[PDB]
Each structure stands twice: as structure tokens, then as C-alpha cells.
Design a binder for this molecule. Structure first.
Ligand code: YGP
Ligand code: YGP
Ligand code: YGP
Ligand code: YGP
Ligand code: GDP
Ligand code: MG
Ligand code: MG
Lengths: 160, 157, 160, 157
């Protein structure tokens, strides 16, 4: 069943006041979109943030993965920089998923990593404190944010 | 030093390719906005949700804390329901801080708890998976979400 | 050539600070999207708005055109209700274009008619005052809105 | 009565499915916020957009009026740049009214002039076609946009 249909049903539940959380069928659909993706676009500058994310994604899918270099001055004055980044990618490349990483909200708010589908829907995301608290190397943070973003919707990065 | 000024300095750092992450002064300003709020709106009309959140906030600040008048479940038809719940609150009550908890994104995407300031800025947030994964009490979950949203910007219970 | 590439060119003009207005290639692409649509969804439950819109759109394209079948009234709790409606249609139906009409922003701000494509981009739009001021039948207002929305991006609705 | 309270009444009409169009009381409130503004910010660092808009607003109010120190061109890669510009002004400046002018949506979609209040709500707005269609100077178009935005909410010169 198409994604549009599963979503119309969750919306009807809410109108009729009987919506009692996320459903199994919904999680399954999000899993499918991710593992069967054919094209993925990652929004970063920097050839080594790209490498951490590409090596993790090749473990869950058989997709072509392309970097896209976003002049970030055009995202970091918006209300929600990471989310802005993914949508910039959405407008200028055809793909099945878009992954981006940046400031969550107002300055001092820390990090967000987010995954969008081909219509801009937020499928999953992950968060980190300001580096002034967690004090980890940016590469190591990206790894953890990705692994948790995949696992909270049911995709394990371990051997099957 | 007022919030407008701190954000201007951060914005001009980004214009000049000098921004190297969140600064000390930015964390301290957020911390202050939260511990010094005189009025907090919880963007909900479910009494269970309201109660866990009111009781926790009462340990970090000294504010009047009220729930909303109308059902925020109608936010569940937008792209980012939790976010929408905050902005609904902001439209219909004056307050220094708005707290809202709902679905993150599309159906299946789990939870988001977010804290907004009086102009709708996003100060901090935390996320959980769908409950069919974590299998916890909703009151337990809200409790862990709020504690993490505070500790990540440097407030400890 | 594809919409992603045309938008990329425009984004690279802004980055390089030589973006001195919309380009003819941009207008042509938007016209083409509208003229060649096969499926259109009108994000309304009002049979009177639907009819003005369907009778006008049939003059410029040869598409299947339908309305939305869940309640749209809850859009009126959000910041930009006409927009929200278009995005609710996007999320629950497959189509090449979405057309919505509602309140512009805050209570008292009048009406917006808006047109989105399959990825949620805003292609064109038009406004009316509150009817406390303009005082006209709704059908007449819908008609004028749609006509201006189409012609400001270069689609003539007249004889020929 | 305050804006929050007028907005809550309208939201309750929608929930009970009795809302129609705009109310008289709502128009008067918006009129009153604009005519009595003490501080207006024009969301731009371009002097030419600033003068046209400053000159028109002085025909309807007695506000102090300012522009910004930073360029708002950095909004032009978002989905709705004119909106984004207004929100960038709201984040770095306290005012009663914010006025912004930019692209409506996607490239080729024309222009939008938009007015926000102190919490970011959209009060009124005006659109033009791309200039390759209308062919007029930018100072003339901005002048037309602003005059229509005020008259559509009932403020005339
Ligand atoms: C993950 C998710 C949250 C959500 O919004 P909420 O207002 O937080 O939750 C609506 C209902 O969904 C169920 N639920 C949400 N979170 C939880 C949870 O963490 N543990 C349990 N047991 N149940 C939950 C409860 O019945 C809630 O009352 C909605 C509407 C959704 O579709 N998915
Ligand atoms: C939290 C935050 C993130 C952010 O955007 P990003 O693209 O993720 O980071 C831009 C720079 O900000 C710093 N930074 C962000 N997160 C981290 C991190 O987790 N560890 C380290 N060492 N540094 C980081 C790095 O120097 C990056 O090169 C920006 C732009 C911001 O203001 N705050
Ligand atoms: C319609 C449109 C507007 C727009 O942003 P703006 O800040 O309003 O204008 C950017 C440049 O686009 C040109 N422009 C915009 N509106 C006009 C106009 O009404 N008349 C003329 N002659 N030119 C205009 C000017 O060169 C502006 O400096 C952008 C960035 C865009 O891509 N399209
Ligand atoms: C200006 C405005 C519009 C609006 O939403 P809409 O879907 O555009 O219109 C809602 C109802 O308000 C009335 N109405 C709206 N626009 C018009 C109009 O232009 N002429 C007339 N006669 N009536 C109108 C009709 O009863 C509509 O069905 C809402 C919900 C609002 O609060 N304000
Ligand atoms: N009797 C009556 N019903 C109305 C009027 N305006 C709207 N309605 C009802 O409300 C429905 C929704 O219309 P509207 O909210 O404009 O549609 P939307 O564009 O889907 O939001 C209509 O189809 C009518 O049944 C009116 O003036 N009189
Ligand atoms: Mg309606
Ligand atoms: Mg003919």
C-alpha cells in the first residue's frame, strides 16, 4: 500500500479522536523506503562528513550516494538550519532520500541530523548537545546521531 | 545582554565564514531564559501530560504554569505536529515559555518534546521512538524527554 | 530539461550575488508544469469553490481533477491556513498539482489562493481582501483569484 | 481586548465548525496595531527599498523606522524567501511591526510584500508578477505593493 494511503488513515484517526500512537504498518513503510532507496543525497560541505554517512548507509541499502555542497550562509540565518539544509537539497537534486546535519534551532540549541523522503516528509531525526558540553570530535558525533536515527524507526546497523 | 544581540553576533559570524559552533554566552542565555521565566504555557489539554511536566519544571524555575483551553490534537494533520502545537499556544496566550509534546514528523516518526521562547524560537528538544518500540508508560517517557531537553543545554535537576 | 536544474542555476546566481530577478526559462518551466498536469487535487470541501476551479482549469489542461475527502477545517488553527491545506493534500494524494484556497495568515487578513507542485514548491498565488471590505459573491472572487494566479506566470485563459 | 483573545475566539469558532470569513472586530485590531506602531523594522539593508517603504508608512503612522545592518539576501534559498526575511528581522530586532519584500516561492514565482507583528503573525501581504512580465522599476512596484497591502485591511492614504 502507498504512503499517501497509510497517512490518510492516521489523519482520519486524529479527526475521529481515536489515534493511539504510531502503528506497526507505518514503521514498516518507513523501513521499506530507506532500505529500497536507489538514490540518496547528503547535504554537507566537507569530504569527510560525507564519508562517515556514506559508509553507514551502504550497510543498510544498495544505493548510489552523492554529496551536495550547500553554501551554509544560506541556511544558518533561518529558524531551523538542519531542516532548511535538507529542503535546499530537495529543490535541486532528484533522489529518494535526503540526509542533512546542522544547528537544530536558535544559536546555542545544539545539533540535529534529519532524513527526508522525496516530498519533504520528515521520516526520522537525531540530536546532540552543543560541543561545548559533549566535547566529542564532529566525526564521532555524526556516527552516533545516524545510528540512533535509523534504530528508532527499526533499522539495525548490526549483522543479520 | 538581550537575546536579539546574541543572535545578531552569531548571524554575522556566519555571514563572514567565522562560525565555529555554539558559544558559551549562547548557552548561558538560554539557561537564564528558562530558570527566570515568570510564566509557562504547556501546549496541551490532557491532564496526565500536564502534570508530569508541571511537577518537573517546578524544580528548576519559579513560574506560574498553566495548560491550554482547547484540544491540541488537531495539530496532528500538519507536517511537524509537535512544533505546530507550540505555535498554536503562542497565538492564544502571553507567556515567557511554551512547552509542547507530540509526533516529530510523518506517522511512524516517533516523538518530539520542544521548548519555545516568547517569539517562537526553538531553544531545546528531545526525541523518542514509536511506543510500539520502547514499550513504556507515556508518563515515564515524557519524564525522560524533559530531563534530557534540560541537560543538553546545561540544566540539571 | 528538468526542474531541479533550472532551480540550481538560480540558487547559484544568489550565492554569487548576481541574482537580478526571475528568468524567462523559469516562467516557461512553471507554465509547462501546469499545462501538462495529468492529475490535480483541489484542497477544499466546498463544492462551490471546487466548480469554479475545475471549470477554469479544464480550459488550460486536460487533467483528472478532484476534491479532498477529509475535513479541511482544522487548517484554520495554523499560521498560514491556505498553505497548510495544500500541504495536507500533498501528504495524502498522488498528483502533479495541488490548488488550495483559505485564510492568508492571522484572523482578519483576507484570502490566499495557492498552487503547489509534487514536491510542495509554491509556483504562484493571489490574494483577496476580507469580504467585510470587498463585499462580493464567493464564486466571483474565486474566479478573479485563479485568473490572476495563472496570468502572473504567463498563462493566458482567453479565447485564441 | 488583547490580540491573543481575539484569535482564541476565532480558533474556537473553527473547532466547533461555525467559523465563516473575517470579523469586523479583527479588522479593527489590525488597523490599530499599524496606525499606533511605535517601532517599525524594514527587513533589508538595501537603502532604496528602505526609502520607498519608510516614506509610505509615514503617511499612516508616526513610528520610528529603521533598516537592518546585515544583508537579508541569505533568505533567497528557502521555500518562501519574503517570509524568511521577515523572520530573520524578528530574530535580531525588537519592534511592533516587521516589513519584508522578496521572492514569493520557487524561482519564477514573482514577489511578495508582507507585514508581521511582534510575534511573527502574518497581518497582510501583496504580490507582483516577475519583472520580465511587468517591466516596471523596483521602486515603483514596491510602492504599489505597499499601498495595496494597507488598503486590503482597510487603511487608506
Ligand atoms: C509517536 C506519536 C505521538 C503522537 O502524539 P501524542 O500526543 O504524544 O500521543 C498520542 C497518543 O499516542 C499514544 N502514545 C504516544 N506516546 C506514547 C508513549 O510514549 N508510550 C505509550 N504507551 N503511548 C504513547 C498515547 O495514547 C497518546 O495519548 C501521535 C499523534 C502519533 O501519531 N505518534
Ligand atoms: C550546534 C551547531 C551546529 C552548527 O552547524 P554544523 O554544520 O553542524 O557545524 C558547523 C561548525 O560548528 C562546529 N560543530 C558543530 N557540531 C560539532 C560537534 O559535534 N563537535 C565539534 N568538535 N564541533 C562541532 C564545527 O566547527 C563545525 O565545522 C552551527 C552552524 C551552529 O551554530 N551550532
Ligand atoms: C521576483 C523575485 C524577487 C527576488 O528578490 P528581491 O530582493 O525582491 O529582488 C532581487 C533582484 O531581482 C530584481 N527585481 C525584483 N523585483 C523587481 C522589480 O519589481 N523590478 C525590477 N526591475 N527588478 C526587480 C532586482 O534586480 C532585485 O535586486 C528574487 C531574489 C527572485 O529570485 N525573484
Ligand atoms: C478571509 C478569511 C477566509 C477564510 O477561509 P475560506 O475558506 O477562504 O472562507 C470561509 C468562509 O467565509 C465566507 N467567504 C470567504 N470569502 C468570501 C468572499 O470572498 N465573498 C463572500 N461572499 N464570502 C466569503 C464563506 O462562508 C466561506 O466558505 C477564513 C477561514 C477566515 O477566517 N478568513
Ligand atoms: N449554509 C452555509 N454553509 C456554508 C457557508 N460557507 C461555508 N459553508 C459550509 O462549510 C463548507 C466548507 O467550505 P469552506 O470552509 O469554504 O471549504 P474549504 O475550502 O474546504 O475550507 C461548505 O461546503 C458549506 O457546507 C454559508 O455561507 N452558508
Ligand atoms: Mg474551511
Ligand atoms: Mg476556443
Amino acid at each position: 500500500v502507498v504512503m499517501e494511503e497509510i497517512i490518510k488513515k492516521a489523519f482520519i484517526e486524529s479527526i475521529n479522536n481515536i489515534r493511539r500512537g504510531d502503528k506497526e504498518e507505518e514503521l514498516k513503510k518507513i523501513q521499506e523506503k530507506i532500505v529500497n532507496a536507489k538514490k540518496i543525497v547528503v547535504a554537507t560541505n566537507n569530504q569527510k562528513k560525507f564519508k562517515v554517512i556514506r559508509d553507514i548507509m551502504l550497510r543498510v541499502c544498495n544505493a548510489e550516494i552523492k554529496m551536495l555542497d550547500i553554501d551554509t550562509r544560506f541556511a544558518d540565518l533561518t529558524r531551523m538550519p538542519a531542516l532548511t539544509k535538507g529542503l535546499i537539497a530537495l529543490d535541486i537534486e532528484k533522489a529518494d532520500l535526503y540526509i542533512a546535519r546542522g544547528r537544530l534551532g536558535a544559536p546555542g540549541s545544539g545539533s540535529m541530523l534529519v532524513i527526508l523522503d522525496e516530498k519533504g516528509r520528515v521520516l526520522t531525526a537525531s540530536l546532540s548537545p552543543s560541543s561545548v558540553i559533549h566535547k566529542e570530535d564532529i566525526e564521532e558525533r555524526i556516527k552516533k546521531e545516524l545510528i540512533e536515527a535509523l534504530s528508532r524507526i527499526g533499522i539495525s546497523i548490526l549483522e543479520h
